[PDB]
Structure 1
Amino acid sequence: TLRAAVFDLDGVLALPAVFGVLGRTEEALALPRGLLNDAFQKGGPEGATTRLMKGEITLSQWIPLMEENCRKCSETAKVCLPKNFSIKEIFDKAISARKINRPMLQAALMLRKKGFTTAILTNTWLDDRAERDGLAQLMCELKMHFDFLIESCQVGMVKPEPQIYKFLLDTLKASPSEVVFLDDIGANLKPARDLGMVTILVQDTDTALKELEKVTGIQLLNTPAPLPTSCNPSDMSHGYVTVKPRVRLHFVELGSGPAVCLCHGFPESWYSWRYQIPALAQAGYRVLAMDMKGYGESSAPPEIEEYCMEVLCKEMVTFLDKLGLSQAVFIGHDWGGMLVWYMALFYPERVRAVASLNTPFIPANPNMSPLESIKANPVFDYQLYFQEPGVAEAELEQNLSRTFKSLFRASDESVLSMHKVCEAGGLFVNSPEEPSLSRMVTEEEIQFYVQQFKKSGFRGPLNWYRNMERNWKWACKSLGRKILIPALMVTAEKDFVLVPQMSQHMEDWIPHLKRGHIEDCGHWTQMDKPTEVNQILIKWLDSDAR
Structure 2
Amino acid sequence: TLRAAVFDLDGVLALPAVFGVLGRTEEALALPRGLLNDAFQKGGPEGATTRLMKGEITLSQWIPLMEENCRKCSETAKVCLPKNFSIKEIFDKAISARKINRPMLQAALMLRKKGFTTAILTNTWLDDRAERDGLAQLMCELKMHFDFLIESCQVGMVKPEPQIYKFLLDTLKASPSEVVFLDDIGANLKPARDLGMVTILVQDTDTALKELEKVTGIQLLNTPAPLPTSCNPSDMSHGYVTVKPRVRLHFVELGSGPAVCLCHGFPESWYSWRYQIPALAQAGYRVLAMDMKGYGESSAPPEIEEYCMEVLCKEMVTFLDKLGLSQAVFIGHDWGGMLVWYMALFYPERVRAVASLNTPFIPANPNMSPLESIKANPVFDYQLYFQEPGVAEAELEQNLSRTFKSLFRASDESVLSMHKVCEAGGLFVNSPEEPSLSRMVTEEEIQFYVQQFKKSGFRGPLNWYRNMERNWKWACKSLGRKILIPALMVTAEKDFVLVPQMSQHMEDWIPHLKRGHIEDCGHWTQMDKPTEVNQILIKWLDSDAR
* Residue number in structure 2 paired with 1:128: 128
- What do residues 497-518 of structure 1 show as CA deviations (whole Å, max 9, x unaligned)? 0000010000000000000000
Q: Tell me the secondary structure at the aligned position of residue 127 of structure 2.
A: coil
- What do residues 180-222 of structure 1 show as CA deviations (whole Å, max 9, x unaligned)? 0000000000000000000000000000000000011000000
Which runs of 5 or more structure 2 residues have no equivalent in the other structure? none
How far has the Cα of 1:433 moved from its partner?
0.3
- What do residues 91-112 of structure 1 show as CA deviations (whole Å, max 9, x unaligned)? 0000000000000000000000
How far has the Cα of 1:82 moved from its partner?
1.1
Establish whether residue 277 from structure 1 lines up as the match of residue 277 from structure 2: yes
1:294·1:456 contact (CA, 8 Å) conserved in 2?
yes
Distance in 2 (alpha carbons) for counterparts of 1:95 and 1:251: 35
1:15·1:101 contact (CA, 8 Å) conserved in 2?
yes
How far has the Cα of 1:298 moved from its partner?
0.1
Aligned identity (percent) is 100
How far has the Cα of 1:474 moved from its partner?
0.2
- What do residues 451-509 of structure 1 show as CA deviations (whole Å, max 9, x unaligned)? 00000000000000000000000000000000000000000000000000010000000
How far has the Cα of 1:174 moved from its partner?
0.1
Distance in 2 (alpha carbons) for counterparts of 1:321 and 1:192: 56
Distance in 2 (alpha carbons) for counterparts of 1:478 and 1:190: 72
How far has the Cα of 1:309 moved from its partner?
0.2
TM-score by length of 2: 1.00
Distance in 1 (alpha carbons) for counterparts of 2:101 and 2:444: 30
2:417·2:430 contact (CA, 8 Å) conserved in 1?
no
2:490·2:517 contact (CA, 8 Å) conserved in 1?
yes
- Give runs of ≥4 in structure 1 deviating > 2 Å: none
Distance in 1 (alpha carbons) for counterparts of 2:69 and 2:253: 47
Q: Tell me the secondary structure at the aligned position of residue 167 of structure 1.
A: helix
Distance in 2 (alpha carbons) for counterparts of 1:162 and 1:394: 65
- What do residues 232-288 of structure 1 show as CA deviations (whole Å, max 9, x unaligned)? 000000000000000000000000000000000000000000000000000000000
* Residue number in structure 1 paired with 2:47: 47
1:283-302 pair list within 5 angstroms: 283-302=283-302
Distance in 2 (alpha carbons) for counterparts of 1:142 and 1:390: 48
- What do residues 368-402 of structure 1 show as CA deviations (whole Å, max 9, x unaligned)? 11001111110000000000000000000000000
How far has the Cα of 1:417 moved from its partner?
2.5
Distance in 2 (alpha carbons) for counterparts of 1:423 and 1:263: 32
Q: Tell me the secondary structure at the aligned position of residue 293 of structure 1.
A: coil
* Residue number in structure 1 paired with 2:192: 192
Q: Tell me the secondary structure at the aligned position of residue 209 of structure 2.
A: helix
Distance in 2 (alpha carbons) for counterparts of 1:190 and 1:43: 21
- What do residues 118-152 of structure 1 show as CA deviations (whole Å, max 9, x unaligned)? 00000000000000000000000000000000000
Distance in 2 (alpha carbons) for counterparts of 1:8 and 1:420: 60
How far has the Cα of 1:418 moved from its partner?
1.9
Q: Tell me the secondary structure at the aligned position of residue 477 of structure 1.
A: helix
1:418·1:497 contact (CA, 8 Å) conserved in 2?
no
2:263·2:337 contact (CA, 8 Å) conserved in 1?
yes
1:488·1:515 contact (CA, 8 Å) conserved in 2?
yes
Distance in 2 (alpha carbons) for counterparts of 1:4 and 1:463: 50
1:272·1:527 contact (CA, 8 Å) conserved in 2?
yes
Distance in 2 (alpha carbons) for counterparts of 1:304 and 1:107: 51
How far has the Cα of 1:419 moved from its partner?
1.4
2:180·2:200 contact (CA, 8 Å) conserved in 1?
yes
- What is the alpha-carbon root mean square deviation over aligned residues? 0.3
1:263·1:332 contact (CA, 8 Å) conserved in 2?
yes
How far has the Cα of 1:540 moved from its partner?
0.2
Distance in 2 (alpha carbons) for counterparts of 1:395 and 1:204: 57
Distance in 1 (alpha carbons) for counterparts of 2:323 and 2:72: 56
How far has the Cα of 1:15 moved from its partner?
0.2
2:308·2:470 contact (CA, 8 Å) conserved in 1?
yes
1:329-478 pair list within 5 angstroms: 329-478=329-478
Q: Tell me the secondary structure at the aligned position of residue 482 of structure 1.
A: coil
Q: Tell me the secondary structure at the aligned position of residue 229 of structure 1.
A: coil
2:59·2:126 contact (CA, 8 Å) conserved in 1?
yes
Q: Tell me the secondary structure at the aligned position of residue 177 of structure 1.
A: helix
How far has the Cα of 1:408 moved from its partner?
0.0
Distance in 1 (alpha carbons) for counterparts of 2:17 and 2:264: 42
Distance in 2 (alpha carbons) for counterparts of 1:425 and 1:363: 31
How far has the Cα of 1:83 moved from its partner?
1.5
Distance in 1 (alpha carbons) for counterparts of 2:511 and 2:327: 22
1:54·1:157 contact (CA, 8 Å) conserved in 2?
yes
Distance in 2 (alpha carbons) for counterparts of 1:214 and 1:27: 37
2:313·2:342 contact (CA, 8 Å) conserved in 1?
yes
Establish whether residue 91 from structure 1 lines up as the match of residue 128 from structure 2: no
